[PDB]
């Protein structure tokens, strides 16, 4: 929006690209949405689409491609799907050179053998950023029923430090053994 150019945010799920529309229209200015049936403001500078629409307007010209700067591929681990993984690669192949790419993902192992493919399919260098240690870590418990009136005991089998605890598993199994469809 600062440079006067245009940007396309593409999400695979039809229901995920509705609240994104709401949040991007509430946070700043004009945000159009395009889907199978919705067509709000096809003149804004932040069109939100499903990839099968960008794949359909790359095969023709559509004159929107003349103004792009960024294409933000949202969930790029849907390339692994069996009936829709070809859409992401028809898009990543047909994109012209003046359009920069942003690829959000979900912590895959071989991120450097994929960014290398896109780096030498185009002829631009691609920077790989990978993180760990999510905020507010999570302790994975296990709840087995006992003294159903008030008492609830939870056994810890994984903790905030990644260490597997066999003790919690054994305690849980033994409680289950001592205790040993809809009504339960």
């Amino acid at each position: 929006q600062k440079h006067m150019t245009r940007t396309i945010y593409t999400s695979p799920i039809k229901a995920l690209s509705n609240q994104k529309f709401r949040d991007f229209r509430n946070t700043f200015g004009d945000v159009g949405l395009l889907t199978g049936d919705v067509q709000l403001h096809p003149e804004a500078s932040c069109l939100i689409m499903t990839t099968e629409i960008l794949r359909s307007m790359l095969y023709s010209g559509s004159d929107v491609i003349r103004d792009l700067e960024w294409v933000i591929f949202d969930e790029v681990h849907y390339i692994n799907d069996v009936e829709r993984g070809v859409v992401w690669e028809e898009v990543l192949i047909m994109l012209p050179d003046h359009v920069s790419i942003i690829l959000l993902s979900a912590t895959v192992p071989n991120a450097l053998e994929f960014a290398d493919w896109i780096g030498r399919l185009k002829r631009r260098q691609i920077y790989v950023i990978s993180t760990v240690t999510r905020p507010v870590p999570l302790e994975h418990y296990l709840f087995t029923g006992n003294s159903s009136k008030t008492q609830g005991e939870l056994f810890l089998l994984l903790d905030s430090r990644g260490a597997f605890h066999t003790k919690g598993y054994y305690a849980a199994v033994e409680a289950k053994k001592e205790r040993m469809g809809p009504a339960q």
């Binding site: 509705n18 609240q19 529309f21 709401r22 949405l33 199978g36 049936d37 919705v38 709000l40």
Partner: protein, 149 residues
């Protein structure tokens, strides 16, 4: 000439067989025209699968024709007359989300056929697909999403 010679409230029910994605069966309490249009559609699909398998492709005719799964023909046929949703809910055993989704995915295909019949040069299919679409979207099936407005 399969679709051209039917009523507009019958072409929608005939085309509902490409979209439902639901457990399927045939019907009994169906008119003759629909029960024969289903056979015509199945014959065209059989011809296409037969020219596919005779070339080198590996997709058996049965596997190609098994994507056609009717079973919302009667429900869509009753929906496109003025019948409210409650009676449809009673009619048959499919979850009421998987019905609104099928109707929404049919009113969006009976509108790309309005665009293709104008391209081929069929002005009677255009005038029937531009009717079968305007009679298909009236109520809570097409309620505007809260997020959008």
């Amino acid at each position: 000439n399969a679709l051209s010679t039917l009523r507009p409230e019958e072409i929608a029910a005939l085309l509902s067989g490409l979209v439902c994605q639901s457990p399927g069966d045939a019907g009994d309490q169906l008119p003759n025209t629909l029960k024969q249009g289903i056979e015509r559609v199945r014959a065209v699909a059989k011809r296409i699968g037969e020219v596919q398998v005779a070339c080198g492709l590996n997709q058996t005719v049965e596997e190609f024709v098994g994507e056609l799964n009717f079973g919302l023909v009667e429900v869509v046929y009753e929906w496109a007359r003025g019948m409210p949703f409650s009676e449809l809910a009673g009619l048959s055993g499919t979850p009421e989300g998987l019905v609104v989704r099928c109707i929404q995915r049919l009113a969006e295909m009976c509108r790309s056929l309005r665009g293709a019949a104008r391209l081929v040069g069929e002005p009677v299919l255009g005038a029937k697909m531009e009717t079968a679409a305007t009679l298909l979207r009236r109520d809570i099936v097409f309620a505007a999403s809260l997020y959008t407005q």
